Design a protein around this ligand. Structure first.
Ligand SMILES: Nc1nc2c(ncn2[C@@H]2O[C@H](COP(=O)(O)OP(=O)(O)O[C@H]3O[C@H](CO)[C@@H](O)[C@H](O)[C@@H]3O)[C@@H](O)[C@H]2O)c(=O)[nH]1
Ligand SMILES: Nc1nc2c(ncn2[C@@H]2O[C@H](COP(=O)(O)OP(=O)(O)O[C@H]3O[C@H](CO)[C@@H](O)[C@H](O)[C@@H]3O)[C@@H](O)[C@H]2O)c(=O)[nH]1
Lengths: 369, 373
């Protein structure tokens, strides 16, 4: 694969944010990551696919696009009765495995065996009030992260299921790989790119240029649904609820590692640094339209995340408030609610959590994995 | 890569038409009813295939995305019929191709279809089927492809594959080129064709009359043919050199029509005995990616329609019933009057002394552009 070389970038504390790189030649001042090495790192990377009532044909399409050596981890939160939508997914995953023999782990987000392993090990941030796993994409992604960890993955990749272009999924995974192959740190994150988006980036760069007195544009993925991390970084990041999860990754990292304070706590991260790559994909971004109400909830908690940043300023908040209010989304004297943030899965006795899950969960399916 | 095994088919004379197969898994122990074509094999095959990209006035960033997705080891051959003055748009393409070459060092050959040096080589060698009233090369895609094919031949390619430029999904392009190799790897014959699949759509309607062209002689109707209008296809130079190419958009459906009226019966075998011995194998693969081109308008849409159907209507294999109902819904729709033309067909390029032809082209063409190829 040929890419523009990571020539430029910006540096806040121990965080290196690279300028967006375009893919130049999809298959082989310019960087050259060969196919053999990409396809090579690939087997150490688990691709997590958060699923929810998605259409079976798009799901199938996405599944077929993941390169065979990537272990696939699926976490559905689909309607489970009237009709049992999950069973419909179980049927497809079973047919898919018979026709491909792809290594796949799948589980439902609301499975009682999951809530039990979480209570037992003392991790409660992911539970609703009834002690059941809370609905949300970040919530399912977190579960995916522990499963990927339970199988000893070094890198994790997220890809959505409502994609009209299987081919784009195939490129996302290879783009992640190249993103880690161009990295020098053990703590690396690769985010991808192709209005919610633009609005979130606008305020994210604003979040930074308020202290630096220089308006910036560096961040173009504040809202990347498609992204990836080295298990090492993923385990120390606290994760936010539902759709607020990718924006918060950025906000938390800047907040915690953008200055040199409390370095003794993360001595190794501060030394190696955090590297964030932003790769522009060749294939267009095309999802199922989920409707206007859905587009408004996302906008809401992605902007609420920036609003509560301990980095947000007087001015940053009002500008948000205004927009958030004159688009029929926030009260005229209402402040956006603080999105719930869950703690870093790090401290969890993984294999022990894995055996409680493995010995009490009715929805867990494993295939050569 | 995984596909559904080439289990079912239909045979007509020395022509075998495979049931459409689906790509099932993208990058790759045996699986029942599944064929496994390992990356290793597809990749050592690619350096042997020339990808031809006919193009005419397409948006530059699109042409860009397509070139970027073609595997690096495939030689690219571009034939442009793009506008020449006010503005010289071919000049724009030359610029994008040069910048693309400096960043990737891909092997590329580009030339403009109307190049006066090209009309000189065709005419000098005795090939006039491609020329207009006034000795200059005729506009039309079948025509561009024919030029691309001769260039592909000049550089010694064993396989040629066509990929359109007005594609919105680069990823798809990358998949097509691989689906072609897969098709040729599963083949047993040296004359092999691989076609991709993804009132009503023109596609659906073309196939309906083509299948009917066949059932009209079989007293059985089929739905075997699913790629009548396959703009994305590939052939072994071997098969490509003995096929006579139809004009404009009629080229694809005519390939099927010709092979059927020429090799669908065991007659006059002497002239193509190796072809009859080997047989013609035709693969039909349904791609994982959807089909998505820039739409060109109502006008363009039925020009294609008329041409595709005119071509089945004039087949020596066609009957009265067929011809009659093709007329019915060509008129019932805005296309025809109530008073179709036979599309022009050019001969096979098998007998054109490539070397003499190529070095005349190479010697007289003001638009030819080469790169490590
Ligand atoms: N497990 C689980 N998955 C979920 C849930 N909610 C949504 N998902 C899945 O997460 C993926 C994305 O969610 P969508 O609801 O489809 O959002 P979108 O409009 O597709 O937007 C996506 O791409 C944007 C790119 O800018 C992202 O910003 C956004 O977060 C999301 O990933 C889909 O596969 C969806 O089914 C959930 O509650 N639990
Ligand atoms: N060299 C050359 N190229 C041409 C010409 N006319 C069209 N092309 C190119 O041939 C490709 C065909 O695209 P269009 O002519 O817009 O046709 P389309 O609507 O995209 O339909 C195509 O795909 C269909 C798939 O079923 C095909 O059926 C159809 O024949 C064509 O290939 C494009 O890259 C187009 O620029 C020409 O006169 N000369």
């Amino acid at each position: 694969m040929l890419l523009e070389a990571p020539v430029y970038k910006e540096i806040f504390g121990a965080v290196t944010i690279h300028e967006v790189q375009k893919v130049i030649k999809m298959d082989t001042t310019i960087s050259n990551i060969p196919r053999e090495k990409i396809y090579d790192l690939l087997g150490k990377m688990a691709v997590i696919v958060p699923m929810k009532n998605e259409k079976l044909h798009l799901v199938d399409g996405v599944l077929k696009a993941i390169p065979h050596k990537c272990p696939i981890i699926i976490v559905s939160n689909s309607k489970r009765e009237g009709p049992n939508r999950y069973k419909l997914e179980v049927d497809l995953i079973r047919h898919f495995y018979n026709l491909t023999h792809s290594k796949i782990i799948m589980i439902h987000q609301k499975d009682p065996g999951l809530a039990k392993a979480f209570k037992e090990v003392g991790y409660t941030d992911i539970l609703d009030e009834n002690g059941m796993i809370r609905s949300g994409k970040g919530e399912g992604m977190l579960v995916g992260l522990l499963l990927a960890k339970a199988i000893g993955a070094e890198y994790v990749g997220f890809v959505d299921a409502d994609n009209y272009i299987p081919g784009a999924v195939n490129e996302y995974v290879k783009d992640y790989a190249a993103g880690f192959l161009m990295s020098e740190s053990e703590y690396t994150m690769v985010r991808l790119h192709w209005r919610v988006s633009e609005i979130t980036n606008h305020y994210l760069n604003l979040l930074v240029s308020e202290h630096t007195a220089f308006e910036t544009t560096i961040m173009v993925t504040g809202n990347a649904g498609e992204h990836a991390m080295t298990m090492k970084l993923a385990e120390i990041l606290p994760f936010s609820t539902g759709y607020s999860i990718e924006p918060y990754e950025i906000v938390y990292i800047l907040e915690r590692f953008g200055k040199w304070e409390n370095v003794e706590e993360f001595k190794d991260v501060f030394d190696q640094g955090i590297e964030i790559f932003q790769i522009e994909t060749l294939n267009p971004h095309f999802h199922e339209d989920k409707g206007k109400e859905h587009v408004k909830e996302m906008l809401l908690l992605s902007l609420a995340t920036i609003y509560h940043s301990k980095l947000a300023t007087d001015n940053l908040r009002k500008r948000i408030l205004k927009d958030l209010r004159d688009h029929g989304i926030l009260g005229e004297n209402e402040e956006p609610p603080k999105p719930l943030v869950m703690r870093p899965i790090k401290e969890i006795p993984i294999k022990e959590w894995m055996d409680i899950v493995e010995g009490n969960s009715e929805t867990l399916l494993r295939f050569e994995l």
